Amino acid sequence: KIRSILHRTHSDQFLVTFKEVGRRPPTFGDASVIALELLNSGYEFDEGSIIFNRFRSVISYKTEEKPIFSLDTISSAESMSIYDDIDADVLRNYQEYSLANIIYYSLKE
Amino acid sequence: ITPVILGLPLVTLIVLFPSLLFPTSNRLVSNRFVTLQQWMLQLVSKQMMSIHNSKGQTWTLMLMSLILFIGSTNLLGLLPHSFTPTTQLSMNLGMAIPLWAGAVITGFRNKTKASLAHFLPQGTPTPLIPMLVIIETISLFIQPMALAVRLTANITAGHLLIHLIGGATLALMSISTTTALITFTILILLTILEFAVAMIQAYVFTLLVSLYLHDNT
Amino acid sequence: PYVLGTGLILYLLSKEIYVITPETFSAISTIGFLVYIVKKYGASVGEFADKLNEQKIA
Amino acid sequence: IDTAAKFIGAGAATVGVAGSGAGIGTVFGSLIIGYARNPSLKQQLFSYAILGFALSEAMGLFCLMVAFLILF
Amino acid sequence: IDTAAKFIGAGAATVGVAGSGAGIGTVFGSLIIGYARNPSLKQQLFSYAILGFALSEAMGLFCLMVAFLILF
Amino acid sequence: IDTAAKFIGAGAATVGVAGSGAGIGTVFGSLIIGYARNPSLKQQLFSYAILGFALSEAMGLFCLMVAFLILF
Amino acid sequence: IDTAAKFIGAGAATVGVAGSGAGIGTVFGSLIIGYARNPSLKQQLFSYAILGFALSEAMGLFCLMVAFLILF
Amino acid sequence: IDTAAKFIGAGAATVGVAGSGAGIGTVFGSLIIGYARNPSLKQQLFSYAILGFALSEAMGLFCLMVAFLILF
Amino acid sequence: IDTAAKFIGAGAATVGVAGSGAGIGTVFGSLIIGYARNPSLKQQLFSYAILGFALSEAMGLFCLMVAFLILF
Amino acid sequence: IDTAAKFIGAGAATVGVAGSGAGIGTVFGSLIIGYARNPSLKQQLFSYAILGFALSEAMGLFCLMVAFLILF
Amino acid sequence: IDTAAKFIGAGAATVGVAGSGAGIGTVFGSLIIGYARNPSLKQQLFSYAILGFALSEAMGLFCLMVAFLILF
Amino acid sequence: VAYWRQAGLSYIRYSQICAKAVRDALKTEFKANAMKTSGSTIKIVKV
Amino acid sequence: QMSFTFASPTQVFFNSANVRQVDVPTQTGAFGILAAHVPTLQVLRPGLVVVHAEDGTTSKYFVSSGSVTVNADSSVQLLAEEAVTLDMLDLGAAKANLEKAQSELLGAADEATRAEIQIRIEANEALVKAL
């Protein structure tokens, strides 16, 4: 029902949609599930945004965005060295991992 | 004559009793006896088999006989003295052919010109360079088989020196004991640090080398 | 126990026929034995634990 | 010359045991810095440590047999 | 002179076998820390370790041949 | 000749303790960085350090057994 | 003196093969602990190991020709 | 010969401090890389560096006893 | 015998510095690789590299005093 | 003596090529374990590999200069 | 004797450059591993590599001074 | 990561198998509960 | 101390709890991440997570995946994808599962299945270590 203000300009630059949103309350696995294949895609941080309604109360949430660090790159650069070792593996493999974590989360929010 | 003649049957005989006993244990008796001795091969079939296969069932029991023989032969050089400087050295030279022949059985007998074709085709020797294969044929066989004789002879050397230095220290300071007791107390403890460690590591070497052959064969 | 006693007797005979020197070579070996007794009893309780139970299991 | 040079000829072959002395410290030291990464201590690593210590005391079984040849 | 300094020439040639003994530990000790990162045991690293044991004990063979040259 | 070459040849066998002393700094150093990644201090790691230094100073006690056999 | 000290001078020149033997152990060890990180086995890491064991036994061929000059 | 071989023999025993010299740099080196991994500096780690410099200078004190035995 | 052996006594006593120079390369290397992991450079760790480069040169002043004793 | 000692002195400086041949094994080793960390293989690391093998072969070319000076 | 032992003593001191040669490789190798961990190549870590080549060539200039004093 | 990263296998793929393997594992009482957080109302569309 | 955040969607166990150590199967090996540890980021790997809580205790865990994130600071967050207490994890099953696992591996298709199997095997072991 989000796919409304978006669904009329594309149907194609969508990558996925989740259905059965909620229902049996949506969860982590799924977040991973939905996380995984998602990765396969050609836009990786043409900075995503994740837009969800972050709850404030059972009645108000604030329609959110957060930004999707898919940099494993500029995140390679910088104060990340400090993560004295870390690998564009393990990096990504956290980025990955966090994609579900968040995914679950956002989803829930 | 007698002395050397008496020794070799004795080394054979100590290995023989265990190897006769286990076949016997398979239905009688057991009383105290058969069940006390049956462990000997339970410790062999327990300890050594944790590495074996690996190279497969076929070759396993053939090698385990020699591994036990080497360790038991060194144990029979431990206690007796004089024994180390002459008798154990003659036994190291009498065990020398078996150790050289051990590589022959499968390696040199089937392929003398390139026994590394059975041992290790790609690894140490470079397969791209037949020159290095022949050079490293010494480092992987010709010398390691000479080093296996030196292997038991280094246990012989360290065990000998304990005895010789002991003897000489109590002879130098024949005080009863007295100051020689301090040195001699160390020289004893060295028998465990030296022989009991090195004797085990010795038959580990025979284990590993005879695995590397038959595992790639 | 009897087997061990037989094995020791054989060793003593082997020393008698092949002995270089009486005392210091003896002193080295004898301390080697004595340490083993006290050690051996502790190891023997372990030896005892394994075996007759391992026999029974298989 | 004959008996005199046999004394300062097994003493220079006794300094060859310095390779086996520190080689056993480099081998067993790497096994102490290996089982710390854990957990294949029983077999795999400590079993390979008995293959590395034998191949380091192999040069010690060839250098101590050299000095013992110039003795008697 | 001819029989003397040939005995003190083989002993110092046996000190060149101190590199192979400490080379054997530093080559089979890095593979004792390689399989600690796992799992190329009996695959790539243990196969190259034999190709590392041969390149180091050959510099012990080319040194023991000098020690055998000044002995026969 | 029979007593002179026994004083300068017992000095060349004292260079075989160069491996037991540099090897001890490798058997304890690789135990310092070993317990740094932690946590098995008492048992496992420091227990393997004792069985390593004993196999490091063994090439120092046997080299001081070939030293004292040339002077006493 | 002339036909003597050159036989004990080729023994001291063969002690330079303790760096070509312990340099190969350091080289063909870090290319075993480095391939454990993977996956540059061919073309990169082991290719540089051919150029690592080329400047290692280069000090040994220069030490095997120094002893060969004190013999032939 | 009697005052000659004890003056050149006390010099060869001073090559046993080359082991304790580099063996002290390693035990204090792995403590520099160990405290870099942090943070148990005082006690445990830097209290073990004394236990690692004592077992390394023990072969040094054993080598400095030999060179002083032929000097006095 | 008296004038000669003191020149071949401070020459073999200079082979004890072969540890003070390599051990300093071991400690200053572990401070070079240690500061890479960061961040205690202008304190704590590089203040332990001065305490390491001294204990290594401590067997480099004790060995140097013996070579200065045999000469003058 | 005057002709004898030059031959015995040329070999003794050829034992100083054991430090340059292992220092090339450490510099090319830590570049083989310094390229596995990736990715600047060309430049930075392997460009400083010849810059680290220049100061370490500088001790060999100076030592083989003192060995050639006692020969010519 | 007096014009002889100066050549069989100045050569043994060149064996003290074995620590200066293998110390230059170890101090630079860990600098090649420290700059592989990134990023302060320009000063801080490679600047300290100059402060590690100096405190390692100092035990090689003091050893080359004693060799030059017994030759000239 | 070579036993999974080999070619492919996300940290997720991996993880999920790990986790899956947990899901595969577990004691019993406890065992019900697993699938609850899994991909379940997982019904992926792009629609 | 490290305020150790030990988590799974299942659970946050230590929730920035001032823990001395957690021993963590990172992918190569582990490390027992000690109380406030340097930044380094490691992605886990199944093993057991052993949370040497500062307290004297160590609590035991099995971990399957996620990342532990070792901040510079005291916050360490193990966000293990799956983080479980061993309580909930059946050794028996693990073993049996392992039985299977090992069985399966043999017909596991490709490194990815094998991997999977293996992941599972490794896992099964990885519970089994402790468990």
Spatial distance between the Cα atoms of A59 and L12, rounded to a whole number of angstroms: 33
D vs E: CB pairs below 8 A:
135
Q: Tell if the CB–CB gap between I7 and K5 is shorter than 8 Å.
A: yes
Which residues of A fall within a CB distance of 8 Å from M79? Answer: 97-98, 101
Distance between CA atoms of I10 and I32, rounded to whole angstroms? 34
Claim to verify: residue M40 and residue M104 sit in the same structural domain = no
Enumerate neighbours of B (3 or more CB pairs within 8 A). C, D, E, F
Residue L1 has a CB neighbour count (10 Å cut-off) of 18
Q: Give how many domains chain M has, as a whole number.
A: 2
For residues M48-64, one letter each, b for 16 or more C-beta atoms within 10 angstroms of the residue's C-beta and e for the rest, the string is bbbbbbbeeebbbbbbb
User: Three-class SS of residue A87?
Assistant: coil
Query: How would you write M31-86 as a 3-class SS string?
Result: CEEECCCCCEEEECCCEEEEEECCCCCEEEEEEEEEEEEECCCCEEEEEEEEEEEH
The candidate with the shortest Cα–Cα distance to M46, out of M22, M66, M70, M71, is: M66
Provide the Cα torsion M58, M61, M63, M66; round to 10°.
-50
- Separation between Cα atoms, residue J41 and residue K52, nearest integer Å: 24
D34 Cβ neighbours under 8 A, 6+ residues apart: D45, E32, E33, E35, E36
Report chain D residues whose CB lies below 8 A from the CB of F47.
none
Structural domains of chain L, count: 1
Torsion from C-alpha of D69, E3, E8, E11, nearest 10 degrees: -40
The answer, yes or no, to whether F and D have at least 3 beta-carbon pairs within 8 Å is yes
Entry field: residues in chain G: 72
Q: Token pair of A52, please?
A: 């969800």
Count CB-CB contacts under 10 A for residue M95: 17
Distance, in Å, from the CA atom of B173 to the CA atom of F57, rounded to the nearest integer, reads 26
**What are the backbone dihedrals phi and psi of residue G30, each rounded to the nearest 5 degrees, phi first?**
-75, -20
Q: What is the secondary structure of J27-71 as a DSSP string?
A: HTHHHHSSSSS-S-IIIIISSSHHHHSSSSSHHHHHHHHHHHTTT
CB contact under 8 A, D39 and M28: no
User: Where do we find the tokens 């837009």?
Assistant: A51
Cα angle, residue J42 at apex, residues J40 and J43 outer, rounded to 5°: 85
- Do residues M114 and M56 share a domain? no
Taking an 8 Å cut-off on Cβ atoms, the answer to whether D8 and F9 are in contact is: yes
Pairing of strands M75-85, A53-57: unpaired
Q: Specify which residues M129 forms β-bridges with.
A: none
Q: What is the CA radius of gyration of chain H?
A: 17
Q: Return the amino acid letter for H2.
A: D
Rounded to whole angstroms, the Cα distance separating J24 from J31 reads: 11
Assess whether M11 and M34 both reside in one domain: yes
Task: Please give, rounded to a whole number of angstroms, the shortest distance from the CA of G40 to a CA of chain D.
Answer: 23
What separation, in Å, do the N-terminal and C-terminal C-alpha atoms of chain M show?
27
* Angle I68-J1-J7 from CA coordinates, rounded to 5°: 85
For residues E59 and G19, what is the distance between their CA atoms, to the nearest angstrom? Answer: 9
> Do residues M68 and M77 lie in contact, with contact meaning Cβ atoms separated by under 8 Å?
yes
Q: Which domain holds residue M120?
A: 90-126
Q: Is the distance from CB of H61 to CB of F64 less than 8 angstroms?
A: no
Residues from chain K contacting residue I18 (CB–CB below 8 Å): 15-19
Question: Helix, strand, or coil here: M14?
Answer: strand
Chain H's closest residue to I33, CA to CA, is H33
Q: Any idea what the CATH number is for the domain that residue L7 is in?
A: 1.10.1620.20
Task: Give the phi and the psi of residue A7 in degrees, each rounded to 5.
Answer: -90, 90
The one-character DSSP state at A10 is B
Handedness of CA F23, F28, F33, F37 (dihedral sign): positive
Residues 6+ apart with CB under 8 A from K38: A81, I36
DSSP bridge partners of M52: M21, M58
Minimal Cβ distance to D12: which of E8, E20, E57: E8
Find chain G residues with C-beta within 8 A of J17's C-beta.
16, 19, 59, 62-63, 66
Chain D contact present for M125, CB below 8 A: no
Strands A66-68 and M40-43: unpaired
Residue with tokens 């100059």: K50
Element (H, E) at M12: strand M12-19
What whole-number distance in Å separates Cα of residue H4 and Cα of residue B181? Answer: 35
Which resolution in angstroms does this entry have? 7.1
DSSP 8-state assignment for residue M5 = E
Cα–Cα distance between M43 and L11 in angstroms, integer? 9
Q: Is I42 on the interface with A (CB under 8 A)?
A: no
Method used to obtain the model: cryo-EM
Amino acid at I70: I
Residue M117 within a domain: yes
In chain F, residues with a C-beta closer than 8 Å to the C-beta of M34 are: 38-39
CB M88 within 8 A of CB L30: yes
Instruction: Please check whether residue F38 touches M, CB under 8 A.
Output: yes
The nearest CA of chain M is from the CA of L40 a distance in Å of: 15
Give domain G1-72's CATH number out of 3.40.50.300, 3.40.190.10, 3.30.390.30, 1.20.20.10.
1.20.20.10
**3-class SS at F46?**
helix
Cβ-contact B76, B11 below 8 angstroms: yes
At residue M76, φ and ψ (nearest 5 deg) are -130, 140
Q: Name, in order, each residue with C-beta under 8 angstroms of E53's C-beta and a sequence gap of 6 or more.
A: B124, B139, D55, E24, E27, E28
Q: Distance between CA atoms of I16 and I13, rounded to whole angstroms?
A: 6
Q: Is the dihedral of CA E34, F20, I30, A80 positive or negative?
A: positive
**Which residues of chain F does H56 touch, with a Cβ-Cβ cutoff of 8 Å?**
21-22, 24-25, 28
Query: Which residue of I lies nearest to H2 if distances are taken between CA atoms?
Result: I1
- How does DSSP classify residue G60? H
Do H40 and F41 contact (CB within 8 A), yes or no?
A: no
Q: For residue H15, which of B106, M69, B87, F67 has the smallest C-alpha distance?
A: F67
Residue L45 domain boundaries: 1-47
How far apart are alpha carbons G64 and G18 in whole angstroms? 11
Contact K20 J19 (CB under 8 A): yes
Quote the minimal CA–CA distance from A93 to chain M in Å. 6
Helices (H), chain A: 28-39, 92-108
Collect all residues of chain M within an 8 Å Cβ-Cβ radius of residue E36. Answer: 28-29
CA F32 to chain centre: 18
Q: How far apart are CA J6 and CA J1, in angstroms?
A: 9
Dist. CA B68–CA B22, nearest whole Å: 14
Distance between first and last Cα of chain H: 16
